[PDB]
Structure formats: C-alpha cells, structure tokens
Design a protein around this ligand. Structure first.
Ligand SMILES: COc1cc2nccc(Nc3[nH]nc(C)c3C)c2cc1S(=O)(=O)C(C)(C)C
Ligand SMILES: COc1cc2nccc(Nc3[nH]nc(C)c3C)c2cc1S(=O)(=O)C(C)(C)C
Lengths: 282, 280
C-alpha cells in the first residue's frame, strides 16, 4: 500500500533551457533545476505526455530512465528526467569518428543491462511490454550504464525505423499489440547491431524492400565481414541473435532465458576492463 | 496525482542471502533477486512498533527517490520475514574509503570533491521536499558508494518530516531544527579532506560532547588539513560556518551548493574516472 507521488515542477524552476533534439514524441531540451542544483532533460511539445510520465514513474528500476517530475502548466507540458550525458546507443555505435573503439566488455555490459531493463518491465504486474525498442532510445549515463526510454508505444499486458519490428507486427491488430515476443526480436537486432557496428540491412535502399525481405525470413547478414571471428563468445551470441529474431514468435526465448545465457559470458570480464573501456571513450 | 506503488518481494525470490553487517536499524545482508537477476541488499531484523519503524523507513526511501538517495527496490512483508530491499552498493561506505588506508592509499581530490558535492545534492533534495525531510543522522557510515563511487544517502530511521556516534551531532542537540544536517556535513567535509578521525586523541565520547558544548571542534591546521589541498581556504570557510556554535550562522544547503559549484567546475570529467581506476 506504499504510494509515492510524482513531483510537479514549475517551468520557471528550469534554468539554462537549451534545445537538444526534435522527434515524433516531442522536443528534448537540457536544463538545470534552480532549487535541486542538478542538470535535467525535458521532453516537451496532453494525455499521451501524462501516460508516458505515469509509465516512467511506475516502472522505476536501475536500467529505466529515472523520471524526476512533470511540468503541468497552461503555458507548458513536459517530462523532466535525469540528464544522460552520453546520449544514445545509436550514437555510440555509428559515430565511428567520435568513437573509433568500443571495447567488447562495454558492448557486453550494455547488452546485459538492456536485457535486465526489459526483463524487469516483463516481470511487472501486469507485464509492461516496450514494443518500440531501438538503439535510439537506449540512453547512456555518465559511466555508459544503460537507461531504457520511450514508453509511448509501451503497453500493459491486460513514424521512424522498422528494422527492430518483427514481421508479424507489420499489419497490426489485437494479437500483435498483445504479443510478449515482440521485444526479444528488437533485442536480437540490437545485439547484431552492437556486435557488428553496422546498420541492419545497410545494402537495401527502400525500407519497404526491407519489410518484404524480413517477411520472407531474411535478416541482417551473419558472416565473417559483419561478425568477425575474433568476437568473444561469437557462437553463443550468434545462437542468441538467431533464436531471438526467429520467424516463428513461439521459438523466440524469454528475457529470463536470455539473461541466464549472458550471466556466464559477463563473468569472463574483469571489472577493470569496464572502467578502461569508458576512459578510452573520453 | 501520478502515484507509484512499492513492489512486495516474496522472501523466497531472494537467493544467496549472506550477512554483511548488524546495526541499531537492523541486519544488512546481500542477495540476488531470482527473477530480476540483479544483486540486492536487504535490511531486516518482533513488535508492533518495531514493524511500523521498518514500514516508515521503506515509505521514506520510496517517497524521497532521487539520484543521490539509496534506491529502494521493494519490501519483504511476510509473517516469516520483514525487510527492506535496495540496490546493492558494491563500494560500501564513505567511512571505509576514508579510513581503510592500506586498501586505499590514494583518494584523489576530484573524487573527494565529487563525493562532497553529491552528499550536499542529496541532503538539499530532502530539505526541498513538501514537507521538508530532515536527515538528522548524517555520518560517513551511511553515505554509501555505488559501483562508480557515486553517493547514495541511506538511514532514514532518525529522519523526520518538518544510540551511536555523537561526532556529527550539533551541541544544541544533546538535550533536545533545520540547522542539524549542515553541522554533520561540516564534520564530514573535515573528515573527507583530512582522512583523520574527528577528535582522535579523545578517550571518552563525553569528553567530545563537553568539548563541542564549549565551542571546540576537530583541529584545523597544517597537520590535519595540509596547505596543498585544492581550494583549502574556501573549504575551511565552509567547514567553520557549517559547524558554528550559533545555528543561525550555519548556511543552508543551497548556499553550500552555490559555494561548491565553481570548485567542481575546475575538475575535468576524465579526472573523476582516473581517480576511480586508481582505487581498483
Ligand atoms: C545527450 O542527449 C540526450 C540526453 C537525454 N537525457 C535524458 C533523457 C533524454 N530523452 C528523453 N527521452 N524520454 C524523455 C521523457 C526524455 C527527457 C535525452 C535525450 C538526449 S537527445 O535527444 O539529444 C538523443 C541522444 C536521444 C538524440
Ligand atoms: C557493501 O556493503 C554494504 C552495501 C550496501 N548496499 C546497499 C544498502 C546497504 N545498507 C542499507 N542501508 N539502508 C538500507 C535500507 C540498506 C539495505 C548496504 C550496506 C553495506 S554494509 O552494511 O556492509 C556497510 C558498508 C554499511 C558496513
């Protein structure tokens, strides 16, 4: 029966408000809270903003973007969260000039924390299904620890890129929106993307042509060029990817199964290697 | 009107339960959550008032959620067992970091200043709540350190909405205030910058209490606070105003933070990372 209320933040308490990005969800800005003396992120532009705040507030966990409050005024409506200084996983994987090396321990830690975050959502009462996982909404804190964001399409078990969407979701309905095998598919594509640092379906022009290929059973390429033979635990990771993005949803594993497979892999990395991987990025 | 409920954790979902420490508040054990696959910490203990105290602590932790407050994950509320489940802090307490000198020969200045800044950020947040939450039991022992040595404030047993060690207690509190936490903070600051035990040459805690009531404080000289400390004069000023005999002369955490902000800006981000790697 222990209940915590989300604080209401007056818009005038946000100082040094600076534009970060503009998306479908709305505009993201950075700011500093004048009383709390911390940096914050603000997602702004009704019911859909409040629904996302409610989900973030209820789904609080170590690998979920921490919500600090809501701006609910006639003048302004926005979601206030902790500021993620290292942006998104998408930026880390594809900004190769900015990041020439992303050490294996760190890539494996990121994959483990994404699975830990999604598993938590799935274990809630009732289960919370993300349904829009992408490298763009896997955010990175000051020490490159994962924070999952974007709960706009996230539904309680009661436009942009399609590369993380299972083929059965292309023509939606009751069954597809209800599916508990959607997030694992997205996770399988993210895993491939993290281990290769390549754009899934890079050689395909139209995203509609990607959709046609995926429905036939075609997936991002698994070979020596995309996934080199020097990748730690390559065979095990390939097995996880291929089961995760299987055409038949029934053949895709649960996040629990995924985590039990990843735990021995993560134990082979000494703690200092995670620290060294992060310093290499600065 | 957005409300979040604290999850109830069945005791059987806590695997590898191992003793860590025993305190006045209760026993602390480490464990792993069988479904969530994460390491956790459990603070556990049979009386109506004793049960109510644990529920009070869990309520405070749940309501006072913030970046520098120990994150609560759930409550174990069973006939068989009653406990508070939180994130596991792998680096223990600030007390251990400052005084285990063989384990930690160097604690670089950027990290010491970052710790001091995060303690002030955490306490300021508590003070800014509606109504204000006053810690009233700040000590180096309940300043916990996460995997990257970021601060998490714990122990909300004595924390009130507006025993043990007396070294962090203002003299007016001996015979029973929004000016208690700043006093504790001033002692913690001295302790962080010196790595010495406050009043180390005293054989009885009553001798500390008598000294403090007479306006005497931990020594500030070249031996305790060397001349090579970054921003030494400013830090000494903060310490001395923070532990002033007259509570009215002690600053607010807002003032304290405005004082610390330019100090923290002089350190490049990579120096914090290098300070942590030096500890491993
Ligand atoms: C450094 O760039 C960003 C930092 C962010 N920190 C926290 C949250 C962000 N976005 C967000 N998602 N959902 C909510 C409710 C909020 C505030 C952040 C977003 C960015 S960004 O927009 O520049 C990026 C890296 C995603 C393009
Ligand atoms: C590594 O040692 C500890 C880690 C801890 N991690 C999280 C919480 C702890 N204590 C706690 N305080 N309040 C609550 C509700 C809880 C669970 C931790 C305590 C320890 S310890 O007891 O070994 C130490 C370092 C304080 C002596």
């Amino acid at each position: 029966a222990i209940c915590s209320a989300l604080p209401t933040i007056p818009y005038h308490k946000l100082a040094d408000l600076r534009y970060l990005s503009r998306g479908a969800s709305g505009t993201v800005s950075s700011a500093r809270h004048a009383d709390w003396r911390v940096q914050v992120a603000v997602k702004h532009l009704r019911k859909d903003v409040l629904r996302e705040a409610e989900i973030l507030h209820k789904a609080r966990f170590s690998y979920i973007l921490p919500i600090l409050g809501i701006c609910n005024e006639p003048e302004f409506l926005g979601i206030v969260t902790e500021y993620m200084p290292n942006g998104s996983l998408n930026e880390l994987l594809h900004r190769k000039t900015e990041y020439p090396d992303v050490a294996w321990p760190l890539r494996f830690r990121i994959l483990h924390e994404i699975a830990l975050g999604v598993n938590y959502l799935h274990n809630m009462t009732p289960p919370l299904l993300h349904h829009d996982l992408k490298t763009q909404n896997i955010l990175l804190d000051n020490e490159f620890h994962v924070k999952i964001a974007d709960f706009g399409l996230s539904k309680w078990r009661m436009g942009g890129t399609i590369i993380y969407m299972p083929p059965e979701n292309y023509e939606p309905g009751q069954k597809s929106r209800a599916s508990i095998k959607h997030d694992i598919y997205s996770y399988a594509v993210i895993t491939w993307e993290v281990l290769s640092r390549k754009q899934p379906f890079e050689d395909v022009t139209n995203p509609l042509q990607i959709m046609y290929s995926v429905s036939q059973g075609h997936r991002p390429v698994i070979n020596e060029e995309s996934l080199p033979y020097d990748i730690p635990h390559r065979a095990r990771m390939i097995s996880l990817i291929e089961s995760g993005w299987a055409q038949n949803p029934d053949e895709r594993p649960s996040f629990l199964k995924c985590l039990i497979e990843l735990e021995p892999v993560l134990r082979t990395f000494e703690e200092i290697t995670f620290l060294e991987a992060v310093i290499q990025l600065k």
